[PDB]
Amino acid sequence: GPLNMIQGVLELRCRTVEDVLTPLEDCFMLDASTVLDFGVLASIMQSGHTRIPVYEEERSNIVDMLYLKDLAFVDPEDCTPLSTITRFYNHPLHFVFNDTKLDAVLEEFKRGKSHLAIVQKVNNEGEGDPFYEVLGLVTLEDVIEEIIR
Amino acid sequence: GPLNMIQGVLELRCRTVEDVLTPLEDCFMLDASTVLDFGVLASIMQSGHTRIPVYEEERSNIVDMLYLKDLAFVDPEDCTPLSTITRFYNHPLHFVFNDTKLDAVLEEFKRGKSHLAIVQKVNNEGEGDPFYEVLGLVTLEDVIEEIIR
Amino acid sequence: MNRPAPVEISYENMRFLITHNPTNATLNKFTEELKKYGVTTLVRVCDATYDKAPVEKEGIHVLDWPFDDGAPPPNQIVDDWLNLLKTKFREEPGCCVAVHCVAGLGRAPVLVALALIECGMKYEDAVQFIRQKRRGAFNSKQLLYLEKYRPKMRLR
Amino acid sequence: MNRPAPVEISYENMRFLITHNPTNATLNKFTEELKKYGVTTLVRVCDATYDKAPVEKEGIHVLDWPFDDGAPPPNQIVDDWLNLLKTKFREEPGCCVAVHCVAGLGRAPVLVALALIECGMKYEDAVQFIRQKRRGAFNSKQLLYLEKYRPKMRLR
């Protein structure tokens, strides 16, 4: 209760996105090449997400964000592709480092439009150049959950 | 910051739904007799609400809740009335007394499906019998806002 | 927290059910609730536009006894009521009498309160027990009436 | 927090811009970013499937100098590069050289780092200043190479 929540807010400064995130495989996401038919739209609305990551052509390559609002006058059949929609709005997409402390992410989320960042860690194993590896998503909920439990 | 939030959680037990609520006139709501055409659907999706009160035939008479999920295979034109939809699902509707302390509402909201209750006070002025006067809506957000400021 | 739902009251052989109003559509579902709670007898006491028989074709004795919004029950009405209860609870004990009305917390609860008092419950306790189950209970006049009420005390 | 966006580096007359890759569609928008930051010269150093001319028809000097993923720049490439910078900054001072590549934090930043070092920035500071603007910087080999690097020191 009130005391747990107090511990939770205090623990924000110690725990990080990694602790709270939602791995890629467990996120509702969309293929850029998808077509907005009755089924997929339904799928969208039934997701109860209002902001959905759009990838191509494998879930870690996240190219765009689809907001629910974006669906406003799309008519199933016509059978519009998802990328024509995404290409109507440059909605920005927020990346966060896996390291970042929750208290910081709280602030970011307040200080923006966003209630969901995509999580990244730099990856050093391999001969190649460093890269950013997408771990999955953290949402404002995910952070609140930290507090109201 | 962390200290404000701590004050906020502690102040939950003192402040009430009335402090935090959203008056009726300022809520997105729907007329039972509405028809789900392209415009109103768009209106819905653009609301960025996922659970919308349905009234008839004046906003304080709240008869039903419309969840976004409920829209899943409705085709604009056919031009389905909103009440045929509401009549597909008995989604329950939660009422809360204007008096109730936020800490309590937090718990209710956790302990249910709901992230929004309709607010009521008993009303004694008048010759008639007491009645419950709908003041408007409190949401889980409204309560979180209390904490993360 | 709650929906717009019925509210059952008991003690001793007496069982009441204060309800909402149906439109004629709901009416099959409304009668279903009624049968569930074991009601024999509905007492309308506000006016309602639903047309009862379906409730009577299901064998619930419906009674139209409207009185004034905000008022205490007219004398007859109270007489009929007490008299109604004796016969109906005599007919089959531990059944339910439903009272219904638009508000839910004005005049319908009064009949119920009346019942408990005339059946030996302290006026104070009566109001509190009702207000427990539905808050808002009655108005000043409803309450005035209730305190000033004097059981015969009449309920076999 | 950030998008997948360009990253500008300056000091002294030198200005660099480490970028993402365009597909041929984005390419008009990509060239728009470039002109904004005042770039004259793009150096591809990973391969990219976009077909450059539109960037050249806009008068940005494009250079295809790919090297191995993870590697430090081949000797020539480094020679060409330093030599390229002298001429291009001589052509108009305070303009920008863009370097682009798929990652953003491997080999492209190395050229830039090389530049700053060969232009008198402490190897340590060089790596830190780059890692400030894009974190992840380089790999062990990239870093080995950078420390072991010895400015002539050659940059007029």
Coordinates of C-alpha atoms in Angstrom, one line a residue:
Chain A
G1 CA 0.0 0.0 0.0
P2 CA 1.1 3.6 0.7
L3 CA 4.4 2.4 2.2
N4 CA 5.1 0.1 -0.8
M5 CA 4.5 2.8 -3.2
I6 CA 6.8 5.0 -1.2
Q7 CA 9.5 2.3 -1.5
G8 CA 8.7 2.1 -5.2
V9 CA 9.3 5.8 -5.9
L10 CA 12.5 5.7 -3.9
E11 CA 13.6 2.6 -5.9
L12 CA 13.1 4.4 -9.1
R13 CA 16.6 5.9 -8.9
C14 CA 18.1 2.4 -8.7
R15 CA 16.3 0.3 -11.1
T16 CA 16.5 0.5 -14.8
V17 CA 14.6 0.0 -18.0
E18 CA 16.0 -3.4 -18.3
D19 CA 14.2 -4.5 -15.1
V20 CA 10.9 -3.3 -16.3
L21 CA 11.0 -3.6 -20.0
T22 CA 8.9 -5.9 -22.3
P23 CA 11.0 -8.2 -24.4
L24 CA 10.6 -7.9 -28.1
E25 CA 8.9 -11.3 -28.6
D26 CA 6.1 -10.4 -26.2
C27 CA 5.2 -7.0 -27.8
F28 CA 2.4 -6.3 -30.1
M29 CA 4.1 -5.1 -33.2
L30 CA 3.3 -4.7 -36.9
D31 CA 5.0 -5.5 -40.1
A32 CA 5.4 -2.4 -42.3
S33 CA 4.2 -4.5 -45.2
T34 CA 0.9 -5.4 -43.5
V35 CA -2.4 -4.5 -45.0
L36 CA -5.1 -2.8 -43.0
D37 CA -8.0 -5.2 -43.7
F38 CA -10.9 -5.8 -41.2
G39 CA -9.1 -8.5 -39.4
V40 CA -5.8 -6.6 -38.7
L41 CA -7.6 -3.4 -37.8
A42 CA -9.7 -5.5 -35.4
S43 CA -6.4 -7.0 -34.2
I44 CA -5.2 -3.4 -33.6
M45 CA -8.2 -2.3 -31.7
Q46 CA -8.3 -5.5 -29.7
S47 CA -4.6 -4.9 -28.8
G48 CA -5.6 -2.1 -26.5
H49 CA -2.5 -0.4 -27.5
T50 CA -2.7 3.1 -28.7
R51 CA 0.8 3.4 -30.0
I52 CA 2.2 0.4 -31.9
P53 CA 5.7 -0.2 -33.2
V54 CA 6.1 -0.9 -36.9
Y55 CA 9.0 -3.0 -38.0
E56 CA 10.3 -4.3 -41.3
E57 CA 11.3 -7.0 -42.0
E58 CA 12.1 -8.5 -38.6
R59 CA 11.0 -7.2 -35.2
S60 CA 14.2 -5.5 -34.1
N61 CA 14.4 -3.2 -37.1
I62 CA 11.9 -0.7 -35.9
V63 CA 11.1 1.9 -38.5
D64 CA 8.0 3.6 -37.4
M65 CA 5.3 4.2 -34.9
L66 CA 1.6 3.7 -35.7
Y67 CA -0.7 5.7 -33.5
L68 CA -4.3 4.7 -33.2
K69 CA -5.4 8.2 -34.4
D70 CA -3.6 7.3 -37.6
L71 CA -6.4 4.9 -38.6
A72 CA -9.1 7.6 -38.6
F73 CA -10.5 7.4 -42.1
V74 CA -9.0 4.2 -43.3
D75 CA -11.6 2.0 -44.8
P76 CA -10.9 -1.7 -44.7
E77 CA -11.0 -2.6 -48.4
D78 CA -9.7 -0.4 -49.7
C79 CA -7.0 -2.5 -48.4
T80 CA -4.4 0.0 -47.5
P81 CA -0.9 -0.9 -46.7
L82 CA 0.5 -0.1 -43.3
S83 CA 3.5 1.8 -44.7
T84 CA 1.3 4.2 -46.7
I85 CA -0.1 5.2 -43.4
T86 CA 3.2 5.5 -41.6
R87 CA 4.3 7.6 -44.4
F88 CA 1.6 10.1 -43.7
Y89 CA 3.0 11.1 -40.4
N90 CA 6.5 11.4 -39.2
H91 CA 5.7 10.4 -35.7
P92 CA 9.0 10.5 -33.9
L93 CA 10.4 7.4 -32.2
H94 CA 12.1 7.5 -28.8
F95 CA 15.0 5.2 -28.0
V96 CA 16.3 4.6 -24.5
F97 CA 19.5 3.0 -23.2
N98 CA 19.0 -0.2 -21.2
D99 CA 21.1 1.4 -18.5
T100 CA 18.9 4.3 -17.8
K101 CA 17.4 4.7 -14.4
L102 CA 13.7 4.6 -14.1
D103 CA 13.5 7.9 -12.3
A104 CA 15.1 9.5 -15.4
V105 CA 12.6 7.7 -17.8
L106 CA 9.8 8.9 -15.7
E107 CA 10.9 12.4 -16.3
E108 CA 11.4 11.9 -20.0
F109 CA 7.9 10.5 -20.4
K110 CA 6.4 13.4 -18.6
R111 CA 8.5 15.8 -20.5
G112 CA 7.3 14.4 -23.9
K113 CA 4.3 13.2 -25.9
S114 CA 5.4 9.7 -25.5
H115 CA 4.4 6.9 -23.3
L116 CA 6.7 4.4 -24.8
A117 CA 10.4 4.2 -25.7
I118 CA 12.3 1.5 -27.5
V119 CA 15.1 0.0 -25.4
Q120 CA 18.7 -0.3 -26.6
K121 CA 22.1 -1.5 -25.4
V122 CA 25.4 -1.2 -27.2
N123 CA 26.8 -4.5 -28.2
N124 CA 30.6 -5.2 -28.2
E125 CA 31.0 -8.9 -29.0
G126 CA 31.8 -9.5 -32.5
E127 CA 34.3 -8.4 -34.9
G128 CA 32.0 -5.9 -36.4
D129 CA 31.4 -2.3 -35.3
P130 CA 29.5 -1.7 -32.2
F131 CA 25.7 -1.6 -32.7
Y132 CA 22.6 -0.9 -30.8
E133 CA 20.6 -4.0 -30.0
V134 CA 16.9 -3.5 -29.5
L135 CA 15.8 -5.3 -26.3
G136 CA 12.1 -4.4 -26.5
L137 CA 9.9 -1.8 -25.1
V138 CA 9.4 0.2 -21.9
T139 CA 6.2 2.1 -21.4
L140 CA 5.0 4.7 -18.9
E141 CA 2.8 2.0 -17.5
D142 CA 5.7 -0.2 -16.9
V143 CA 7.2 2.5 -14.8
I144 CA 4.0 3.3 -12.9
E145 CA 3.6 -0.5 -12.2
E146 CA 6.9 -0.1 -10.4
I147 CA 5.3 2.4 -8.1
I148 CA 1.7 1.2 -7.6
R149 CA 3.2 -2.2 -6.4
Chain B
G1 CA 10.5 14.8 -8.2
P2 CA 11.0 11.8 -5.9
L3 CA 10.0 13.8 -2.8
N4 CA 6.9 15.3 -4.5
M5 CA 5.8 11.9 -5.5
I6 CA 6.3 10.7 -1.9
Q7 CA 4.1 13.6 -0.7
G8 CA 1.6 12.6 -3.4
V9 CA 1.2 9.0 -2.4
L10 CA 0.9 10.1 1.3
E11 CA -1.8 12.7 0.2
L12 CA -3.8 9.9 -1.4
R13 CA -5.5 9.2 1.9
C14 CA -6.7 12.7 2.2
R15 CA -7.9 13.7 -1.2
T16 CA -10.9 12.5 -2.9
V17 CA -12.3 11.8 -6.3
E18 CA -13.9 15.2 -6.3
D19 CA -10.5 16.9 -6.3
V20 CA -9.3 14.9 -9.2
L21 CA -12.4 14.2 -11.3
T22 CA -13.3 15.3 -14.7
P23 CA -16.5 17.2 -14.9
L24 CA -19.2 15.9 -17.2
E25 CA -19.1 18.7 -19.7
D26 CA -15.4 18.1 -20.3
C27 CA -15.6 14.3 -21.0
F28 CA -15.7 12.6 -24.3
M29 CA -19.0 10.8 -24.3
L30 CA -21.4 9.2 -26.7
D31 CA -25.0 9.4 -27.4
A32 CA -26.5 5.9 -27.4
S33 CA -28.5 6.9 -30.5
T34 CA -25.3 7.7 -32.4
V35 CA -24.4 5.9 -35.6
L36 CA -21.0 4.5 -36.2
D37 CA -20.1 6.2 -39.5
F38 CA -16.5 7.0 -40.7
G39 CA -16.6 10.4 -39.0
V40 CA -17.7 9.2 -35.5
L41 CA -15.4 6.2 -35.6
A42 CA -12.6 8.5 -36.5
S43 CA -13.8 10.7 -33.7
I44 CA -13.6 7.7 -31.4
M45 CA -10.1 6.8 -32.4
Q46 CA -9.0 10.4 -32.3
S47 CA -10.3 10.6 -28.8
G48 CA -7.4 8.5 -27.5
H49 CA -9.8 7.0 -25.0
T50 CA -10.1 3.3 -24.9
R51 CA -13.2 3.2 -22.8
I52 CA -16.0 5.7 -23.6
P53 CA -19.2 6.4 -21.6
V54 CA -22.4 6.0 -23.5
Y55 CA -25.4 8.2 -22.3
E56 CA -28.9 8.6 -23.4
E57 CA -30.4 11.2 -23.9
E58 CA -28.5 13.6 -21.8
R59 CA -25.0 13.2 -20.5
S60 CA -25.7 12.4 -16.8
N61 CA -27.8 9.4 -17.7
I62 CA -25.0 7.0 -18.3
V63 CA -26.3 3.7 -19.6
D64 CA -23.3 1.9 -21.0
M65 CA -19.7 1.7 -21.6
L66 CA -18.2 1.4 -25.0
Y67 CA -14.7 -0.2 -25.1
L68 CA -12.5 0.3 -28.2
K69 CA -12.3 -3.5 -28.6
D70 CA -16.1 -3.4 -29.3
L71 CA -15.5 -1.7 -32.6
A72 CA -13.6 -4.7 -34.1
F73 CA -15.5 -5.7 -37.1
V74 CA -17.8 -2.8 -37.5
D75 CA -17.9 -1.5 -41.0
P76 CA -18.7 2.1 -41.4
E77 CA -21.7 1.9 -43.7
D78 CA -23.2 -0.4 -42.8
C79 CA -24.1 2.3 -40.5
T80 CA -24.5 0.6 -37.2
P81 CA -26.1 2.3 -34.3
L82 CA -24.1 2.6 -31.1
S83 CA -26.7 0.9 -29.0
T84 CA -26.7 -2.2 -31.1
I85 CA -23.0 -2.5 -30.2
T86 CA -23.5 -1.8 -26.5
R87 CA -26.1 -4.4 -26.5
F88 CA -23.6 -7.0 -27.6
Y89 CA -21.6 -6.7 -24.4
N90 CA -22.8 -6.2 -20.9
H91 CA -19.6 -4.4 -19.9
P92 CA -20.1 -3.4 -16.3
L93 CA -20.0 0.2 -15.2
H94 CA -18.4 1.3 -12.0
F95 CA -19.8 4.1 -9.8
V96 CA -17.8 5.8 -7.1
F97 CA -19.0 8.3 -4.4
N98 CA -17.6 11.8 -4.6
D99 CA -16.4 11.3 -1.0
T100 CA -14.1 8.4 -1.6
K101 CA -10.5 8.8 -0.8
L102 CA -8.1 8.4 -3.6
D103 CA -6.1 5.8 -1.8
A104 CA -9.2 3.7 -1.9
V105 CA -9.9 4.3 -5.6
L106 CA -6.4 3.4 -6.4
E107 CA -7.1 0.0 -4.8
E108 CA -10.4 -0.5 -6.5
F109 CA -8.8 0.3 -9.9
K110 CA -6.0 -2.2 -9.3
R111 CA -8.5 -4.8 -8.0
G112 CA -10.6 -4.6 -11.1
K113 CA -10.6 -4.5 -14.9
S114 CA -11.5 -0.8 -14.8
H115 CA -9.5 2.3 -15.2
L116 CA -12.5 4.6 -15.0
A117 CA -15.4 5.0 -12.5
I118 CA -18.3 7.3 -12.8
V119 CA -18.5 9.8 -9.8
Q120 CA -21.7 10.3 -7.8
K121 CA -22.9 12.3 -4.7
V122 CA -26.2 11.9 -3.0
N123 CA -28.3 15.0 -3.4
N124 CA -30.7 16.1 -0.6
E125 CA -32.1 19.5 -1.8
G126 CA -35.5 19.2 -3.2
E127 CA -38.7 17.9 -2.2
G128 CA -38.1 14.7 -4.1
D129 CA -36.4 11.6 -2.9
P130 CA -32.6 11.6 -2.6
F131 CA -30.9 10.8 -5.8
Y132 CA -27.4 10.2 -7.1
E133 CA -26.0 13.1 -9.2
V134 CA -23.4 12.2 -11.7
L135 CA -20.4 14.7 -11.3
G136 CA -18.3 13.2 -14.1
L137 CA -15.5 10.8 -14.4
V138 CA -12.4 9.7 -12.5
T139 CA -9.8 7.6 -14.2
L140 CA -6.7 5.7 -13.1
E141 CA -4.7 8.4 -14.8
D142 CA -6.3 11.1 -12.8
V143 CA -5.0 9.3 -9.7
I144 CA -1.6 8.6 -11.0
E145 CA -1.4 12.3 -12.0
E146 CA -1.8 12.9 -8.3
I147 CA 1.4 11.0 -7.7
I148 CA 3.7 11.8 -10.5
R149 CA 3.2 15.5 -9.7
Chain C
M1 CA -17.8 0.0 -6.1
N2 CA -21.2 -0.8 -7.5
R3 CA -23.5 -1.0 -10.6
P4 CA -27.1 0.1 -10.9
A5 CA -28.2 -3.2 -9.3
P6 CA -31.0 -4.6 -6.8
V7 CA -30.5 -4.7 -3.1
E8 CA -31.9 -7.4 -0.8
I9 CA -32.9 -6.9 2.8
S10 CA -33.8 -9.6 5.4
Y11 CA -35.0 -10.2 9.0
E12 CA -36.9 -12.0 10.2
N13 CA -39.0 -14.1 7.9
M14 CA -39.1 -10.9 5.8
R15 CA -37.1 -10.4 2.7
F16 CA -37.3 -7.4 0.5
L17 CA -35.7 -6.4 -2.7
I18 CA -35.4 -2.7 -3.7
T19 CA -35.0 -2.4 -7.5
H20 CA -34.5 -0.2 -10.6
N21 CA -37.0 0.2 -13.4
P22 CA -37.1 -1.8 -16.6
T23 CA -38.1 -0.6 -20.0
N24 CA -40.2 -3.2 -21.9
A25 CA -37.1 -4.5 -23.5
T26 CA -35.1 -5.3 -20.4
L27 CA -38.3 -6.8 -19.0
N28 CA -37.6 -10.4 -19.7
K29 CA -34.1 -9.9 -18.0
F30 CA -35.8 -7.9 -15.2
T31 CA -38.2 -10.7 -14.4
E32 CA -35.3 -13.1 -14.5
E33 CA -33.6 -11.2 -11.6
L34 CA -36.8 -11.2 -9.8
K35 CA -37.4 -15.0 -9.9
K36 CA -33.7 -15.4 -8.8
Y37 CA -34.2 -13.5 -5.6
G38 CA -37.5 -15.5 -5.0
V39 CA -39.9 -12.6 -5.3
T40 CA -43.6 -13.1 -5.4
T41 CA -44.8 -9.6 -5.3
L42 CA -43.6 -6.4 -6.9
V43 CA -44.8 -3.1 -5.6
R44 CA -44.5 -0.3 -8.1
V45 CA -44.5 3.0 -6.2
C46 CA -43.3 5.6 -8.7
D47 CA -44.8 5.2 -12.1
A48 CA -43.0 3.1 -14.7
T49 CA -43.6 2.6 -18.4
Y50 CA -43.2 -1.0 -18.8
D51 CA -46.3 -3.0 -19.1
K52 CA -46.4 -5.6 -16.4
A53 CA -48.2 -8.8 -17.4
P54 CA -45.1 -10.5 -18.5
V55 CA -44.1 -10.2 -14.9
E56 CA -47.6 -11.5 -14.0
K57 CA -47.5 -14.2 -16.7
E58 CA -44.5 -15.4 -14.8
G59 CA -46.7 -15.4 -11.7
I60 CA -45.3 -12.5 -9.8
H61 CA -48.0 -10.5 -8.1
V62 CA -47.6 -6.9 -9.3
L63 CA -49.0 -3.9 -7.3
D64 CA -49.3 -0.3 -8.6
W65 CA -49.2 1.9 -5.6
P66 CA -47.6 5.1 -6.7
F67 CA -47.1 8.0 -4.3
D68 CA -45.7 11.4 -4.4
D69 CA -42.0 12.0 -5.1
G70 CA -40.4 12.8 -1.8
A71 CA -43.5 12.1 0.3
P72 CA -44.1 9.6 3.0
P73 CA -46.5 6.8 2.1
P74 CA -50.2 7.8 2.2
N75 CA -52.1 6.1 5.1
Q76 CA -53.8 3.5 3.0
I77 CA -50.8 2.6 1.1
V78 CA -49.1 1.8 4.4
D79 CA -52.1 -0.2 5.6
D80 CA -52.4 -2.1 2.3
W81 CA -48.6 -2.8 2.5
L82 CA -48.5 -4.2 6.0
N83 CA -51.6 -6.2 5.3
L84 CA -50.0 -7.3 2.0
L85 CA -46.9 -8.5 3.8
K86 CA -48.9 -10.7 6.3
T87 CA -50.7 -12.5 3.5
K88 CA -47.7 -12.9 1.2
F89 CA -45.2 -14.1 3.9
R90 CA -48.0 -16.4 5.2
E91 CA -48.4 -17.8 1.7
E92 CA -44.8 -19.0 1.6
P93 CA -42.4 -17.9 4.3
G94 CA -38.9 -16.6 3.4
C95 CA -39.9 -15.4 -0.1
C96 CA -39.3 -11.9 -1.3
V97 CA -41.3 -8.8 -1.8
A98 CA -39.8 -6.5 -4.3
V99 CA -40.4 -2.8 -4.2
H100 CA -39.3 -0.7 -7.1
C101 CA -39.0 2.9 -8.1
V102 CA -36.9 5.2 -10.3
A103 CA -34.5 6.5 -7.6
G104 CA -34.1 3.5 -5.3
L105 CA -33.4 5.6 -2.3
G106 CA -36.6 7.6 -1.6
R107 CA -40.0 6.1 -1.1
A108 CA -39.4 2.5 -1.9
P109 CA -36.9 2.2 1.0
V110 CA -39.5 3.8 3.3
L111 CA -41.9 1.0 2.9
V112 CA -39.2 -1.4 3.7
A113 CA -38.1 0.7 6.8
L114 CA -41.8 0.8 7.9
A115 CA -41.8 -3.0 7.6
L116 CA -38.8 -3.5 9.9
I117 CA -40.0 -0.9 12.5
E118 CA -43.5 -2.4 12.6
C119 CA -41.7 -5.6 13.0
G120 CA -39.8 -4.4 16.1
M121 CA -36.5 -2.8 14.8
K122 CA -35.4 0.4 16.5
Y123 CA -36.2 3.3 14.2
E124 CA -32.5 4.4 14.4
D125 CA -31.3 0.8 13.5
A126 CA -33.8 0.6 10.7
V127 CA -32.5 3.8 9.0
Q128 CA -28.9 2.7 9.5
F129 CA -29.5 -0.9 8.2
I130 CA -31.1 0.5 5.1
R131 CA -28.5 3.2 4.6
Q132 CA -25.8 0.5 4.9
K133 CA -27.2 -1.3 1.8
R134 CA -28.1 1.8 -0.1
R135 CA -26.6 5.1 0.9
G136 CA -28.5 8.2 0.7
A137 CA -31.5 6.6 2.2
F138 CA -34.2 9.0 2.8
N139 CA -34.9 12.7 2.9
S140 CA -35.7 14.8 5.9
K141 CA -39.4 14.3 5.5
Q142 CA -38.8 10.5 4.9
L143 CA -36.8 10.5 8.2
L144 CA -39.2 12.7 10.1
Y145 CA -42.0 10.4 9.2
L146 CA -39.9 7.4 10.2
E147 CA -39.1 8.6 13.7
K148 CA -42.6 9.9 14.4
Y149 CA -43.9 6.4 13.2
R150 CA -45.4 4.2 16.0
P151 CA -45.7 0.4 15.4
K152 CA -49.0 -1.0 16.7
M153 CA -46.9 -3.2 16.8
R154 CA -48.6 -5.1 13.9
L155 CA -47.1 -8.0 12.1
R156 CA -48.3 -11.3 13.4
Chain D
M1 CA 16.2 10.5 -25.5
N2 CA 17.0 10.3 -29.3
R3 CA 15.9 9.3 -32.8
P4 CA 18.0 7.7 -35.5
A5 CA 19.4 11.1 -36.4
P6 CA 22.8 12.7 -37.7
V7 CA 25.4 13.9 -35.3
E8 CA 27.7 16.9 -35.9
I9 CA 31.3 17.3 -34.7
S10 CA 33.4 20.5 -34.8
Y11 CA 36.8 21.9 -34.0
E12 CA 38.7 23.7 -35.3
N13 CA 37.8 24.7 -38.8
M14 CA 36.7 21.1 -39.1
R15 CA 33.1 20.0 -39.0
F16 CA 31.9 16.5 -39.6
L17 CA 28.5 14.8 -39.7
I18 CA 28.2 11.2 -39.0
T19 CA 24.9 9.9 -40.6
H20 CA 22.5 7.0 -41.2
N21 CA 21.8 5.4 -44.6
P22 CA 19.1 6.3 -47.0
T23 CA 17.1 4.1 -49.4
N24 CA 16.5 5.8 -52.7
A25 CA 13.2 7.0 -51.5
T26 CA 14.4 8.9 -48.5
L27 CA 17.1 10.2 -50.7
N28 CA 15.7 13.6 -51.5
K29 CA 15.0 14.1 -47.7
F30 CA 18.5 12.7 -47.0
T31 CA 20.1 15.2 -49.3
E32 CA 18.0 18.0 -47.6
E33 CA 19.5 17.2 -44.2
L34 CA 22.9 17.3 -45.8
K35 CA 22.6 20.7 -47.4
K36 CA 21.2 22.0 -44.0
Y37 CA 24.4 21.1 -42.1
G38 CA 26.5 22.6 -44.9
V39 CA 28.1 19.4 -46.2
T40 CA 30.2 19.3 -49.4
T41 CA 31.5 15.9 -49.3
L42 CA 29.9 12.6 -48.2
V43 CA 32.2 9.6 -47.6
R44 CA 30.4 6.2 -47.9
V45 CA 32.4 3.7 -45.9
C46 CA 30.1 0.7 -45.6
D47 CA 28.2 -0.1 -48.7
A48 CA 24.8 1.4 -49.3
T49 CA 22.1 0.7 -51.9
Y50 CA 21.1 4.1 -52.8
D51 CA 22.4 5.5 -56.1
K52 CA 24.2 8.7 -55.4
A53 CA 24.0 11.1 -58.3
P54 CA 21.0 12.9 -56.8
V55 CA 23.3 13.8 -54.1
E56 CA 25.9 14.8 -56.7
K57 CA 23.3 16.6 -58.9
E58 CA 22.9 18.6 -55.8
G59 CA 26.6 19.2 -55.8
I60 CA 27.8 17.2 -52.8
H61 CA 31.0 15.4 -53.6
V62 CA 30.3 11.7 -52.8
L63 CA 33.2 9.2 -52.1
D64 CA 32.8 5.5 -52.0
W65 CA 35.5 4.2 -49.6
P66 CA 34.2 1.1 -48.0
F67 CA 36.2 -0.9 -45.6
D68 CA 35.8 -4.0 -43.5
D69 CA 33.1 -4.2 -40.8
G70 CA 34.9 -3.8 -37.5
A71 CA 38.3 -2.9 -39.0
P72 CA 40.4 0.1 -38.8
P73 CA 40.7 2.1 -42.0
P74 CA 43.2 0.7 -44.5
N75 CA 46.3 2.9 -45.0
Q76 CA 45.3 4.5 -48.2
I77 CA 41.9 5.2 -47.1
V78 CA 43.4 7.1 -44.2
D79 CA 45.8 8.9 -46.6
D80 CA 43.1 9.8 -49.0
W81 CA 40.9 11.0 -46.1
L82 CA 43.4 13.4 -44.5
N83 CA 44.4 14.6 -48.0
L84 CA 40.7 15.0 -48.8
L85 CA 40.1 17.1 -45.7
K86 CA 42.9 19.6 -46.5
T87 CA 41.5 20.3 -50.0
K88 CA 37.9 20.4 -49.0
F89 CA 38.3 22.7 -45.9
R90 CA 40.7 24.8 -48.0
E91 CA 37.9 25.0 -50.7
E92 CA 35.5 26.7 -48.2
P93 CA 36.4 26.8 -44.5
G94 CA 33.8 25.8 -41.9
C95 CA 31.9 23.5 -44.2
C96 CA 31.0 20.0 -43.4
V97 CA 32.3 16.6 -44.4
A98 CA 29.7 13.9 -43.9
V99 CA 30.7 10.3 -43.2
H100 CA 28.0 7.7 -43.4
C101 CA 27.6 4.1 -42.7
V102 CA 25.0 1.6 -41.4
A103 CA 25.9 1.4 -37.8
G104 CA 27.0 5.0 -37.1
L105 CA 29.3 3.9 -34.3
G106 CA 32.0 1.8 -35.9
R107 CA 34.2 2.8 -38.8
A108 CA 32.7 6.2 -39.7
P109 CA 33.5 7.6 -36.3
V110 CA 37.1 6.4 -36.6
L111 CA 37.8 8.6 -39.6
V112 CA 36.5 11.5 -37.6
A113 CA 38.5 10.5 -34.5
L114 CA 41.6 10.2 -36.8
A115 CA 40.9 13.7 -38.0
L116 CA 40.8 15.2 -34.5
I117 CA 44.0 13.4 -33.4
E118 CA 45.9 14.2 -36.5
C119 CA 44.7 17.7 -35.8
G120 CA 46.2 17.7 -32.3
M121 CA 43.5 16.3 -29.9
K122 CA 44.6 13.9 -27.2
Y123 CA 43.7 10.4 -28.2
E124 CA 41.8 10.0 -24.9
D125 CA 39.9 13.3 -25.4
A126 CA 39.1 12.3 -29.0
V127 CA 37.5 9.0 -28.0
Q128 CA 35.6 10.7 -25.2
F129 CA 34.3 13.6 -27.3
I130 CA 33.0 11.2 -30.0
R131 CA 31.5 8.9 -27.3
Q132 CA 29.8 11.9 -25.8
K133 CA 27.9 12.5 -29.1
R134 CA 27.3 8.9 -30.0
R135 CA 27.7 6.4 -27.3
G136 CA 29.1 3.0 -28.1
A137 CA 31.9 4.6 -30.0
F138 CA 34.3 2.0 -31.2
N139 CA 35.4 -1.5 -30.6
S140 CA 38.5 -2.8 -29.0
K141 CA 40.3 -2.9 -32.4
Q142 CA 39.0 0.5 -33.3
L143 CA 40.3 1.8 -29.9
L144 CA 43.6 -0.1 -30.2
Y145 CA 44.2 1.5 -33.5
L146 CA 43.3 4.9 -32.2
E147 CA 45.8 4.8 -29.3
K148 CA 48.6 3.3 -31.4
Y149 CA 47.9 6.0 -34.0
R150 CA 50.7 8.7 -34.3
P151 CA 49.8 12.1 -35.9
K152 CA 52.6 13.3 -38.2
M153 CA 51.1 15.7 -37.2
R154 CA 49.6 16.4 -40.6
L155 CA 46.8 18.9 -41.2
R156 CA 48.1 22.3 -42.4

